[PDB]
Every structure is written in C-alpha cells, then in structure tokens.
Design a binder for these strands. Structure first.
Lengths: 113, 114
DNA sequence: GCCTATAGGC
DNA sequence: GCCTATAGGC
DNA sequence: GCCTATAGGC
DNA sequence: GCCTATAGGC
C-alpha cells in the first residue's frame, strides 16, 4: 500500500489511511475492446504523518499513459474524506465500498483488484 | 492580483509572481453562441512567500461553473515556470505573452481581458 | 476524465 | 417532486 | 521537413 | 479540458 509515486506533493510526507481490514487504496480497470476502452482509475485516501490532515488522491488515464489527477484536501475532516472516496468508488463501479468483499462487476463500469 | 481563492493549497502561503510590468496572472474567455461556447481559462504563476519555489496554476470551465484545475510545481526553476505559463498562453490565444500589449483576437481561440 | 443541466421514470 | 441515466460542453 | 489543426480516449 | 497520434497545409 504505497502512496502513488505520481503524487509528488505527498510521497514524502503521508500514508495511505487504514483501519485494520479497511485500507483506503484501490485500483480500478475497465477494458472493453468493443469500445476501445483500456483505462484505469486509482483512488487513495491519505493522512499526513506530521499532522492529522487528510486528502483524497485520484489518478486516471489509458493504461500505460500517465493521465490526469486530482488531490482533494480535507483538513482533518476524516468523514468528508471517507465520503468522497466511497462516493467516487460507487460512481465508478456501481458497488458500495463497505460491500467490497462481495464485488459484482457491472457492464460499462469499472472492475476492481 | 490575489491568488485564486480556489487554489486552496496556496492561498495565503504564496503570491502571484511579478517583475515590473510583467504580472503573471491572466483570465481568458471564449464566447461563441453558434457552437454554445462560453468558457474561461485562468493562469497564474505563483511564488511561495517563505521560499523561492514556483508553481503554475490553471483553472478552467464554463463561465459561472466550478470546472477543473491543475497545479504544476517547478521548485526554484523560474524559467520552467515562465515557459509553461507563456506556452499555455500561446496555445490558447495564438498570441505571444511578452509581445501582446497589442493583443489580436483570432476566431476560435480565447480572448483576453483587462 | 471533469462538472452539471436535463429529460424520462417512478 | 424526487432520482438517476444521458450527453453537452469543458 | 516543420508546424498547427484535428480527432480519439480519458 | 488533458495528452497524444495522425492528417494536412506551407
């Protein structure tokens, strides 16, 4: 569970946030040669080590290409950050994150693991 | 020349960079009712207050709406940063930055303002 | 991909 | 009126 | 060959 | 919009 090296603003100073089982780091894929999809979507909830301060990192593109990315800062509001992460996970897969163990792929939606 | 408030990671820790005339802050517009374009593009070269460290901020979207944005870090390489800023200005308007007190709008490219 | 307005479906 | 899928512009 | 407009996928 | 691969004009 290393912080995405592409997140230059945090690779030195922060960790992926966890609570036992629940490690808020995940990689998504949708390959579909009918529509020429071969694309990823990474999501990471990050806490700083120095201060109690949270961020959500998202990064996406065609497999192989460094794509685009977003870093959303939450300043200690862990709930904001879990919401963003979980909402986005749902948006892209049509599965709830808490329901991760029993993941059911959907047509035209991202796949996990 | 305040830092865009939407740049949460640098509002209050940094300033728009200037050198005499040249203030590296600018807003672009392209309206074209035929194709329903009504969009902006902001660009800002920023120096940190406490250290010699530069960044380019870009932010764009439909007029009124939130949009997307990018922050490009340059460390103390001010030339990298001027390049990025100026290149991007050229990409979007078809006019060079330094020679455009006399700015000439072109069809299907962004316009400046004052 | 992003954001968000809008049309169709309860 | 509400919810979500669709696509319209960025 | 160089350079800029376009187009495809994200 | 981005990043890129290719098409097209001088």
């Amino acid at each position: 569970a290393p912080v995405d090296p592409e997140c230059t603003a945090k690779v030195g100073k922060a960790h992926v946030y966890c609570e036992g089982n629940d490690v808020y780091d995940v990689m998504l894929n949708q390959t579909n040669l009918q529509f020429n999809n071969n694309k990823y979507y990474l999501i990471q909830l990050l806490e700083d080590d120095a201060q109690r301060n949270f961020s959500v990192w998202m990064r996406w593109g065609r497999v192989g290409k460094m794509g685009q990315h977003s870093l959303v800062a939450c300043s200690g509001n862990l709930n904001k950050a879990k919401e963003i992460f979980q909402k986005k996970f749902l948006d892209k897969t049509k599965n709830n994150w808490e329901d991760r163990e029993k993941f059911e792929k959907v047509p035209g939606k991202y796949d996990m693991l």
